[PDB]
Amino acid sequence: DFEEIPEEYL
Amino acid sequence: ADCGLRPLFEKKSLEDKTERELLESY
Amino acid sequence: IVEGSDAEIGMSPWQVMLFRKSPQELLCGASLISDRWVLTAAHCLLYPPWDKNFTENDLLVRIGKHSRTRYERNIEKISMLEKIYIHPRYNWRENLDRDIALMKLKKPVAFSDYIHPVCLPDRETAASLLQAGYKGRVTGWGNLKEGQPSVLQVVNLPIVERPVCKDSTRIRITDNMFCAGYKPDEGKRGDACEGDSGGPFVMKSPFNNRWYQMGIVSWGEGCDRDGKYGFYTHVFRLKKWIQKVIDQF
Ligand SMILES: Nc1ccc2cc3ccc(N)cc3nc2c1
């Protein structure tokens, strides 16, 4: 449900 | 040191929509 | 938040979102107390009865947010955690006594119009403000009913006398908690709800006009149920512990 966040944060 | 003073409110001397409710309860 | 309203932009710049990495979900609220430290409820991270035991690598801290679900591109800041500290005497077995935890960020966030720390109370601020009838403010992206908001919600609630807090529940209340909310007769409603835990209960000092965090959303029995109240971790009573850990490293 949440918008995808930038991959550098994961 | 700068804690608790909101850039968009206290710092510009603007009040939010319901903070008076809090102050009036004191 | 039940029976609250949409927060204004920049209204609660210390509001932090605890975000699970996989699956992507809102875990809890939290607050920014310095450029490196975040304050939340211990039960947001550690709660054995439900096999909840999150470590630093399981979580992300999102600061400066307004929209619950949207990635607010040049507004919010997402931080990784370096270390989580849970109160050594947090009582998850019985009543969530000393429900508090500190999280150290991997690196400092820069303050902005949307990101700014809240003050921790000193002895006298706590003494002057923590009084029955005085209203504090609770914010969060939690459920609207016992469904989910699109934007940060806010509700102002009165602190309730200790006797009525203890008489509304079978749970043993300690000095490290206070409860807040409207009584059934008062007509007004409002309460925290699922997803709001760990968030700040703040009050604005009439003496120096600063916002202080007096409590942490801890627990409740249902949400906005008549004759029931929200319980909050008493931040000042645990400030000695807070200072100790930030001093240690
Ligand atoms: N005042 C509050 C504070 C925290 C809360 C946490 C909750 C978790 C699950 C659930 N079903 C209801 C909850 N209600 C709360 C009410």
Coordinates of N, CA, C and O in Angstrom, one line a residue, chain B residues 1-11 14-23 25-26, chain C residues 8-11 13-14 112-113 116-117 119 133-137 156 182 203-204 209-211:
Chain B
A1 N 18.8 22.8 22.1 CA 19.1 24.2 22.3 C 18.0 25.0 21.5 O 17.5 26.0 21.9
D2 N 17.8 24.5 20.3 CA 16.8 25.1 19.4 C 15.5 24.3 19.4 O 14.5 24.5 18.7
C3 N 15.5 23.3 20.3 CA 14.4 22.3 20.4 C 13.0 23.0 20.7 O 12.9 24.1 21.3
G4 N 12.0 22.3 20.1 CA 10.6 22.7 20.4 C 10.1 24.0 19.7 O 8.9 24.3 19.9
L5 N 10.9 24.6 18.9 CA 10.5 25.8 18.2 C 10.4 25.5 16.7 O 11.4 25.2 16.0
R6 N 9.2 25.4 16.2 CA 9.0 24.9 14.8 C 9.3 26.0 13.8 O 8.8 27.1 13.8
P7 N 10.1 25.6 12.7 CA 10.5 26.5 11.7 C 9.3 27.3 11.1 O 9.3 28.5 10.8
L8 N 8.2 26.5 10.8 CA 7.0 27.1 10.2 C 6.0 27.8 11.1 O 5.0 28.3 10.6
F9 N 6.2 27.7 12.4 CA 5.3 28.3 13.3 C 6.0 29.3 14.3 O 6.1 30.5 14.0
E10 N 6.5 28.7 15.4 CA 7.2 29.6 16.4 C 8.2 30.6 15.8 O 8.2 31.7 16.2
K11 N 9.1 30.0 15.0 CA 10.1 30.8 14.4 C 9.6 32.0 13.5 O 10.3 33.0 13.4
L14 N 3.9 32.3 13.8 CA 2.6 31.9 13.3 C 2.1 30.8 14.2 O 2.9 30.0 14.7
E15 N 0.8 30.7 14.4 CA 0.2 29.7 15.3 C -0.5 28.7 14.5 O -1.1 29.0 13.5
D16 N -0.5 27.4 15.0 CA -1.2 26.4 14.3 C -2.7 26.5 14.6 O -3.1 27.3 15.5
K17 N -3.5 25.7 13.9 CA -5.0 25.8 14.0 C -5.6 25.4 15.4 O -6.7 26.0 15.7
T18 N -5.0 24.6 16.2 CA -5.6 24.3 17.5 C -4.7 24.4 18.7 O -5.0 24.0 19.8
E19 N -3.5 25.1 18.6 CA -2.6 25.2 19.7 C -3.2 26.0 20.9 O -2.9 25.8 22.0
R20 N -4.1 27.0 20.5 CA -4.8 27.8 21.5 C -5.6 26.9 22.5 O -5.7 27.2 23.7
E21 N -6.2 25.9 22.0 CA -6.9 24.9 22.8 C -6.0 24.4 24.0 O -6.5 24.3 25.1
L22 N -4.8 24.1 23.7 CA -3.9 23.6 24.7 C -3.5 24.7 25.7 O -3.6 24.5 26.9
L23 N -3.2 25.9 25.2 CA -2.8 27.0 26.1 C -3.9 27.4 27.0 O -3.7 27.7 28.2
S25 N -6.1 25.5 28.3 CA -6.4 24.5 29.3 C -5.4 24.6 30.4 O -5.6 23.9 31.4
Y26 N -4.4 25.4 30.3 CA -3.4 25.5 31.4 C -3.8 26.4 32.5 O -3.4 27.6 32.6
Chain C
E8 N -1.4 20.1 10.0 CA -0.9 21.1 9.0 C 0.6 20.7 8.7 O 1.2 20.0 9.5
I9 N 1.0 21.2 7.6 CA 2.4 21.0 7.2 C 3.3 21.6 8.2 O 3.1 22.8 8.6
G10 N 4.3 20.9 8.6 CA 5.3 21.4 9.5 C 4.8 21.5 11.0 O 5.5 22.0 11.8
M11 N 3.6 21.0 11.2 CA 3.0 21.1 12.6 C 3.7 20.3 13.6 O 3.7 20.7 14.8
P13 N 7.2 18.7 13.4 CA 8.4 18.3 12.7 C 9.3 17.3 13.4 O 10.3 16.8 12.8
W14 N 9.0 16.9 14.6 CA 9.7 15.9 15.3 C 9.0 14.5 15.1 O 9.6 13.5 15.6
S112 N 15.3 21.0 8.8 CA 14.7 21.8 7.7 C 13.4 22.3 8.2 O 13.1 22.2 9.4
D113 N 12.6 22.9 7.4 CA 11.3 23.4 7.7 C 10.4 22.2 8.2 O 9.5 22.5 9.0
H116 N 12.7 18.9 12.7 CA 13.1 19.7 13.8 C 12.9 18.9 15.1 O 11.8 18.3 15.3
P117 N 13.8 18.8 16.1 CA 13.7 18.1 17.3 C 12.7 18.7 18.4 O 12.6 20.0 18.4
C119 N 11.7 19.1 22.5 CA 12.4 19.2 23.8 C 12.0 18.1 24.7 O 10.9 17.7 24.8
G133 N -6.5 17.8 33.5 CA -7.2 18.8 32.9 C -6.4 19.6 31.8 O -6.9 20.1 30.9
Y134 N -5.1 19.6 32.0 CA -4.2 20.2 31.0 C -4.2 19.3 29.7 O -4.1 18.1 29.9
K135 N -4.2 19.9 28.6 CA -4.3 19.2 27.3 C -2.9 19.0 26.7 O -2.1 20.0 26.7
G136 N -2.7 17.9 26.1 CA -1.5 17.6 25.4 C -1.9 17.2 24.0 O -3.1 17.2 23.7
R137 N -1.0 17.0 23.1 CA -1.3 16.7 21.7 C -0.7 15.4 21.2 O 0.5 15.1 21.5
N156 N -5.9 16.7 20.3 CA -5.5 17.2 21.6 C -6.4 16.6 22.7 O -7.6 16.5 22.6
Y182 N -10.8 12.1 27.1 CA -12.0 12.6 27.6 C -12.9 11.6 28.3 O -12.8 10.4 28.0
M203 N 3.3 18.9 24.8 CA 2.6 20.1 25.4 C 3.5 21.3 25.1 O 4.7 21.2 25.0
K204 N 2.8 22.4 24.9 CA 3.6 23.7 24.6 C 3.7 24.4 25.9 O 2.7 24.7 26.5
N209 N 7.4 29.0 25.4 CA 6.7 28.7 24.1 C 7.4 27.6 23.3 O 7.2 27.6 22.1
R210 N 8.0 26.7 24.0 CA 8.6 25.5 23.3 C 7.7 24.3 23.5 O 7.0 24.2 24.5
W211 N 7.8 23.4 22.6 CA 7.1 22.1 22.7 C 7.9 21.1 23.4 O 9.1 21.0 23.1

